[PDB]
Amino acid sequence: MEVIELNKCTSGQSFEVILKPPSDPSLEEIQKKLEAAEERRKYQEAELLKHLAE
Amino acid sequence: MRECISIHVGQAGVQIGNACWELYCLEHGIQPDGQMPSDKTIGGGDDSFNTFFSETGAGKHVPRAVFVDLEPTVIDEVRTGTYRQLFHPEQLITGKEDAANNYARGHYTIGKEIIDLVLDRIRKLADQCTGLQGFLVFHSFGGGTGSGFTSLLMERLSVDYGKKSKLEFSIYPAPQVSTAVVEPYNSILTTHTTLEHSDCAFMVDNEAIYDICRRNLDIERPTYTNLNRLISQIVSSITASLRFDGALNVDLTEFQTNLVPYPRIHFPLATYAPVISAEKAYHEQLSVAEITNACFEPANQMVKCDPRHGKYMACCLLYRGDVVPKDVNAAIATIKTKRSIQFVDWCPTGFKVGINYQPPTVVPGGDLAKVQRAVCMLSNTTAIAEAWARLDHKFDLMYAKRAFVHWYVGEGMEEGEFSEAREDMAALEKDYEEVGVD
Amino acid sequence: REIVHIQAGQCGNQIGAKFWEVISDEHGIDPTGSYHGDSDLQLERINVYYNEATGNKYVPRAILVDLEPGTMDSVRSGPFGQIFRPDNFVFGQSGAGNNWAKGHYTEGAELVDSVLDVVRKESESCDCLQGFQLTHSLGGGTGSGMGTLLISKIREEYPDRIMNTFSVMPSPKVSDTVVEPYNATLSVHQLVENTDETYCIDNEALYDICFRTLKLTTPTYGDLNHLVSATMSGVTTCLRFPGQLNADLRKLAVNMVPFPRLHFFMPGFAPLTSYRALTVPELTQQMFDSKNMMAACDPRHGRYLTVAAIFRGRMSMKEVDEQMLNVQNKNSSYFVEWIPNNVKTAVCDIPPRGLKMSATFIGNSTAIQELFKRISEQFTAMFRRKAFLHWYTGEGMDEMEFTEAESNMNDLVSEYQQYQDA
Amino acid sequence: MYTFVVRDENSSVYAEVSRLLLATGQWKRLRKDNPRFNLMLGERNRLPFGRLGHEPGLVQLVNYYRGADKLCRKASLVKLIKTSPELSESCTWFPESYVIYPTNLDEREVFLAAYNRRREGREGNVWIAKSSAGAKGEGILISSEASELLDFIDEQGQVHVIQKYLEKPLLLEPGHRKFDIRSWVLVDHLYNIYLYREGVLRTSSEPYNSANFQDKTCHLTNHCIQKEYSKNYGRYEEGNEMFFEEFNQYLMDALNTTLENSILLQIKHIIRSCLMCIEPAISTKHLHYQSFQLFGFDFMVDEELKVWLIEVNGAPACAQKLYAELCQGIVDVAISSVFPLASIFIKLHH
Ligand SMILES: Nc1nc2c(ncn2[C@@H]2O[C@H](COP(=O)(O)OP(=O)(O)OP(=O)(O)O)[C@@H](O)[C@H]2O)c(=O)[nH]1
Ligand SMILES: Nc1ncnc2c1ncn2[C@@H]1O[C@H](COP(=O)(O)OP(=O)(O)CP(=O)(O)O)[C@@H](O)[C@H]1O
Ligand SMILES: Nc1nc2c(ncn2[C@@H]2O[C@H](COP(=O)(O)OP(=O)(O)O)[C@@H](O)[C@H]2O)c(=O)[nH]1
Ligand SMILES: [Ca+2]
Ligand SMILES: [Ca+2]
Ligand SMILES: [Ca+2]
Ligand SMILES: [Mg+2]
Ligand SMILES: [Mg+2]
Structure with missing residues (x-):
């Protein structure tokens, strides 16, 4: 229907056709999530080695 | 620049x-x-x-x-x-x-x-x-x-x-x-x-x-x-x-x-046409109406889903090659009268169109034949939520049994991150259905 | 990304030597460690199992372990005997006398530190060690008792690496001693806690296949080990050759093991060997057939949690998916529905020796519980009367440790049964 | 070996298709949440169409058309007919209808407008208010005063339709009784439209009384309303069901015509018009899974032998003596057409 914003250049062109109208976490916090996971890994490994020591 | x-x-x-x-x-x-x-x-x-x-x-x-x-x-x-x-x-x-x-x-x-x-x-x-x-x-x-x-x-x-x-x-x-x-x-x-x-x-x-x-x-x-x-x-x-x-x-x-x-x-949702075999010697070159029409065929989508059963929030057509705006508008006119293209009430029913005259390039010795004209459609349709629903169902099947979860927990992830992630996805599915379903 | 291989005791070393013979031949390495293959694919992932020495020699990353010299002189004299690193033969003189207590606690403890010394040496030259592969039996003393001692100590020193075993389970049909159920039960308990992946190689199954299918009236360990050789080659293909699926030990474990304790696999192979290549449909049908299973469990008695299939040879990549899909779509009852798409398929163009094509099956099936049930009944029949127990308490063990091993195995059984009804 | 899953245990039609499938020995039924199926006999509400046709190596088929609800809901059928150029507001076979929302939330003033011109022209101004929340025989009001219509709708929370009540229905004799025709239509995956040979008349066993719309038993022809409130259930015919052979004989004896000429041409025309209208929206021609669906069209006939469309049911049951034939037919042209093993339908061409 209505064609608008027609722009032409050597490379090509663009336009808009309307047919009808309508009706973050900080570095530090990321840092603590990474360390919280690391500590859970170390804790689980510490338990394993303790169990192996027994 | x-x-x-x-x-x-x-x-x-x-x-x-x-x-x-x-x-x-x-x-x-x-x-x-x-x-x-x-x-x-x-x-x-x-x-x-x-x-x-x-x-x-x-x-x-x-x-x-x-x-x-x-x-x-x-x-x-x-x-x-x-x-x-x-x-x-x-x-x-x-x-x-x-x-x-x-x-x-x-x-x-x-x-x-x-x-x-x-x-x-x-x-x-x-x-x-x-x-x-x-x-x-x-x-x-x-x-x-x-x-x-x-x-x-x-x-x-x-x-x-x-x-x-x-x-x-x-x-x-x-x-x-x-x-x-x-x-x-x-x-x-x-x-x-x-x-x-x-x-x-x-x-x-x-x-x-x-x-x-x-x-x-x-x-x-x-x-x-x-x-x-x-x-x-x-x-x-x-x-x-x-x-x-x-x-x-x-x-x-x-x-x-x-x-x-x-x-x-x-x-x-990305949709692309035409895709033609280079092993195909004699090839009839598709028109603007045809490649545009092919943009509304699920068989051509980067994600298989049925846009007829959702709503559009936006649509962009990106043409490469031998394409003039007159033919694009004629093609969009004709397609509007056949296809199921429902937009959300608070968006204009319409298309932003881009044309670059240089036809697609094909890697030499590839599977894709050179064409005179091609189009890529980007449309934000709620139908793509079908992919989320599929994915979330598989997640739900395994997670209910906690299958494989120990591999993640062993890397120091807490189990709660699973159900938190899943909840976010449940909300995601909800947002889509609100916007797209009568 | 290297694998360190360890073979312990008679069974472990004999099947271990065969494995190195067979894959050396696949990678085109001769008995003197020189390469003479005509394909580039042979050398692409060669370092996974082989070290390089000057002269471009390839030396297996293999450690051979035993409590008596006997079997290892046989290896060193055997076909590819000269290919192993001389320092990697680690052995004592007393033997374990088919006694888990001797292997695990008395005779074995005396030899284990020197083994760990060679393991450490091999690891220290590894760019990025994946983990370990151990071949052994569970019915004897050294492979079973010292083998599981090794596993525990290796885990203590390399707690973040993958531990994989090929474990030969005992059968009264191919039995060396009446105390095999004791040794096996004590060992299963170790495996459950300390391996990530175990291929259950059942001597029961190997015998039945030789007798029933291959028509061998009087099967020998040589015949049994022929089947073990082919299975081991087939299930390590994705580690040894380039590919997408299960290409290292951790990714395999992640695909195959949904719960940590349930990591005991049923291997399967086709064609069962001892002029016409099988069709892809024949490979597929046979590899899922119970008579091709290396664990002597009826897969129709349980359900598959996960499955890995590996096809070797030049065949229709298309026809493989059709067959693999058809197997699942037509017996979907025997696959748990709460692990979607739990069957994964690999193809490798290089066939094994003497075959145009073959297929190797790896199932995590709840039916493996039959194997543990069988051992558990044999164990209990003797333990209930404390028969032969004094040979174990005489090495410093008390009955309680038997009781706990028995409980742990029965728990394992109930866990399989848990997921077979889900 | 073909596989299928059953997800609507309350379906008499597909429970019969299920046993027919198993009885061929070439179909296997699976646990309802097993995805490795060829055929989904789906649930009525929120059937998960988005999870279909993503199973590598399995041609998948479902017994429902996604989007057919547009046809099979009171309000949305009205909307579909008014807003589709193929049907049009000048559609001559659909009674004058309006979609009315209760005020606790529309087409109200549009309905009043037309209601005035009738009261103004001495014209018969009896309308029937109904909705989709109306289970069986309850939730229906037949009034000649518009006020009672809208006041009754506001006593309901869901959307309603008001539609011109046919004051001159064809009356069967003896009995002087209203009726409606149920037609079963099967649409296969190729979008062939198949009209089942046998229909049925849901008859009233009470004489039509155009002076008392309060007694809903000579006005409503529902089988539940007759089997309860009517004191003449099964008098003229068994279960208030007159089948086509009898009805046609009647039309010949009484009116000197045939079922085919007087009524069936119109019925086939209506069925084609409705289903061709929505085809672009629901066809699974180039889709990654396939659909078929069994529909139940309900018709009214007036004393001029004009056929009016009342509604379309998307999950119809069948008459008792017709279950076997129609179910065998569903297996035959809708299922086995897609999954070949080792006519009772009239095809409406287009
Ligand atoms: N389209 C496409 N998909 C790929 C490609 N490579 C892998 N995938 C898909 O990506 C998923 C696997 O993820 P990858 O990217 O291979 O894994 P990764 O990011 O390397 O992560 P890790 O190996 O687990 O450390 C699977 O769904 C594959 O099918 C590719 O080259 N093209
Ligand atoms: N505009 C109208 N004029 C005359 N009679 C009408 C009418 N609308 C409905 N009826 C009568 O209303 C009754 C139909 O009810 P309705 O169309 O709502 O079906 P229903 O959903 O209640 C049960 P089913 O789905 O099996 O048809 C019929 O007996 C019919 O005679
Ligand atoms: N398949 C197979 N099983 C063996 C072999 N040698 C021994 N066994 C089995 O292993 C168990 C005996 O253990 P063995 O390895 O000989 O004792 P170990 O030297 O103390 O570890 C019994 O179950 C035997 O049946 C062999 O070469 N192949
Ligand atoms: Ca941002
Ligand atoms: Ca420049
Ligand atoms: Ca000593
Ligand atoms: Mg021995
Ligand atoms: Mg990667």
Whole structure:
């Protein structure tokens, strides 16, 4: 229907056709999530080695 | 001129990156050694193609890209391959052992050890930019690195580049070529954590690409190579406006304002036509009406779903080749009268249209025949939520039994992150149904 | 990304030597460690199992362990005997006398530190060690008792690496001693806690296959080990040759093991060997057939949690998916529905010796519980009367440790049964 | 070997298709949440169409058309007919209808407008208010005063339709009784439209009384309303069901015509018009899974032998003596057509 914003250049062109109208976490916090996971890994490994020591 | 940096994460991101930068060079007349005989400004310049390539004083055109994988074998092939001369060493980053298809291993255990390095290699390219607009991030949903490391990278990019757009090209998992039972886990985990950090993401379901290669290229058993060459055509069609003279979509920002009114609903459906076998000698060249009409065939979508049963929030048509605006408007007129194209009430029923006169380039010795004209449609339709519903169902099946969850918990992830991620997805499915269903 | 291989005791070393013979031949390595193959694929992932020495020699990353010299002189004299690193033969002189207590606590403890010394040496030259592969039997004393002692100590020193075993389970049909159920039960308990992946190689099954299918009236360990050789080659293909699926030990574990304790696999192979190549449909049908299973469990008695299939040879990549899909779509009852797409398929172009094509099956099936039930009944029949127990308490063990091993195995059985009704 | 799953245990039609499938020995039934199926006999509400056709190596088929609800809901059928150029507001075979929302939330004033011109022209101004929440015989009001209509709708929370009540229905004799015709139509995956040979008349066993719309038993022809409130259930015919052979004989004896000429041409025309209208929206021609669906069209006939469309049911049951034939037919042209093993339908061409 209505064609608008027609722009032409050597490379090509663009336009808009309307047919009808309508009706973050900080570095530090990321840092603590990474360390919280690391500590859970170390804790689980510490338990394993303790169990192996027994 | 405003630069874009491309980041390629994990096997899928890297190999797709390969196919794209191969294609970019072919389209811009850049040779494998990085020279570009048509670029009469030696050493620099702010042409449209410089948004993706920097220049050495020796007339070398170098991609604004970084490749990252947690294991070396895939990136080693870039380092040794045809376009080895293209990238410099600092652009290709590899670890020793991968994330083993485990989001938690990619994000927490191994991610913590390489993230600062990767951000530094990225800070380098950023420092070469007079006006960085942001990032294009390529990755799989299913891989441990693609899912887990990408989401950690995206969190940090928002910290270190708050004002910058980030766009994704994401490979949605398909059992026909997938390599891990837990990819639905990885998909939901990465989508949950990346959601607030991505401004716009183009999902490619390997299922759809696989079937387009079988059906239209007559390839009985498509390879990653077949898939990626096709994918790179869609990617090229989508980025072409950033690399060539034009008035749409001239920068990453415009991608969001043209396709994404609802911030969380930032996953536009890509549809591409025509896809023609190069082994097909006599080929009748499709018209503008025909290739436009093919944009409303699910068989041509990057994700199989039924747009008739959803609503549109936005639609962009990107034509390459022999196309004049008159024929496009005639084609859209006729299609409007046949197809089911319901827009949401608060959006205009309409199409933004871009035409680049240079027809698609095809990798010589490829599977795709050269055509006179092609189109890529980007439409933000609620129908794409079918992919979320599929994925969430698989997640629900395994998680109810806690199948495989100990692999993630063992990497230091808490179980609650599972159900949190799943809840975010349940909300996501809810947002789509609100917007698109009477 | 290297694998360190360990073989312990008579069974472990004899099947271990065969494995190295067979894959040396696949990678084109001769008995003197020199390469003479005509394919590039042979050398691409060669370092996973082989070290390089000057002269371009390839030396197996293999450690040979035993409490008596006997079997290892046989190896060193055997076909590829000269290919092993001389320092990697670690052996004592007393033997374990088919006694788990001797292997695990008395005779074995005396020899284990020197073994760990060679393991440490091999690991220290590894670019990025994946983990370990151990061949052994569970019915004897050294492989079983010292083998599981090794596993525990290796885990203590390399707690973040993958531990994989090929464990030969005892059968009264091919039995050396009446105390095999004791040794096996004590060992299963170790495996459950300390391995990530175990291929259950059942001597019961190997015998029945030789007798029933291959028509061998009087099966020998040589015949049994022929089947074990082929199975081991087939299930390590994805580690040894380039490919997408299960290409290292951790990714395999992530695909195959949904719950940590349930990591005991039923291997299967086709064609069962001892002029016409099988069709892809024949490979597929046979590899899922109970008579091709190496664990002597009826797969129709349980359900598959996960499955890995590996096809070797030049065949229709297309026809493989059709067959693999058809097997699942036509017996979908025997696959748990709460692990979607739980069957993964690999193809490798290099066939094994003397075959144009073959297929190797790896199932995590709840039917493996039959194997543990069988051992558990044999164990209990003797333990209830404390028969032969004094040979174990005489090495410092008390009955309680038997009781706990028995409870742990019965628990394992109830866990399989748990998921077979889900 | 073909596989299927059953997800609607309350369906008499597909429970029969299920046993027919098993009885061929070439079909196997699966646990309802097993995805490796060829055929989904789906649930009525929120059937998960988005999870269909993503199973590598399985041609998948479902017994429902996604989007057919547009046809099979009171309000949305009205909307579909008014807003589709193929049907049009000047559609001559659909009674004058209006979609009315209760005020606790529309087409109210549009309905009043037309109601005035009738009261103004002495014209018969009896309308029937109904909805989709109306289970069986409850939730229906037949008034000649519009006020009682809208006041009754506001006593309900869901959307309603008001529609011109046919004051001159064809009356069967003896009995002087209203009736409606049920037609069963099967649409296969190729979008062939198949009209089942046998229909049935849901008759009233009470004489039509155009002076008392309060007694809903000579006005409503529902089988539940007759089997309860009517004191003459099964008097003239068994279960208030007159089948086509009898009805046609009647039309010949009484009116000197045939069922085919007087009524069936119109019925086939209406069925084609409705289903061709929505075809672009629901066809699974180039879709990754396939659909078929059994519909139940209900018709009214007036004393001029004009056929009026009342509604379309998307999950119809069948008459008792017709279950075997129609179910065998469903297996035959809708299922086995897609999954070949080792006519009772009239095809409405287009
Ligand atoms: N389209 C396409 N998909 C790929 C490609 N490579 C892998 N995939 C898909 O990506 C998923 C696997 O993720 P990968 O990218 O390979 O894994 P990764 O990012 O390297 O992570 P890890 O290996 O687990 O450390 C599966 O769904 C694959 O099918 C590719 O080259 N092209
Ligand atoms: N505009 C109208 N004029 C005359 N009679 C009408 C009418 N609308 C409905 N009826 C009568 O209303 C009754 C139909 O009810 P309705 O169409 O709502 O079906 P229903 O949903 O209650 C049960 P089913 O789905 O099996 O048809 C019939 O007996 C019919 O005679
Ligand atoms: N399949 C197979 N089984 C064996 C072999 N040698 C011994 N066995 C079995 O292993 C058990 C005996 O253990 P063995 O390894 O000989 O004792 P060890 O030297 O103390 O470890 C019994 O179950 C035997 O049946 C062999 O070469 N092949
Ligand atoms: Ca320049
Ligand atoms: Ca942001
Ligand atoms: Ca001593
Ligand atoms: Mg990887
Ligand atoms: Mg022995």
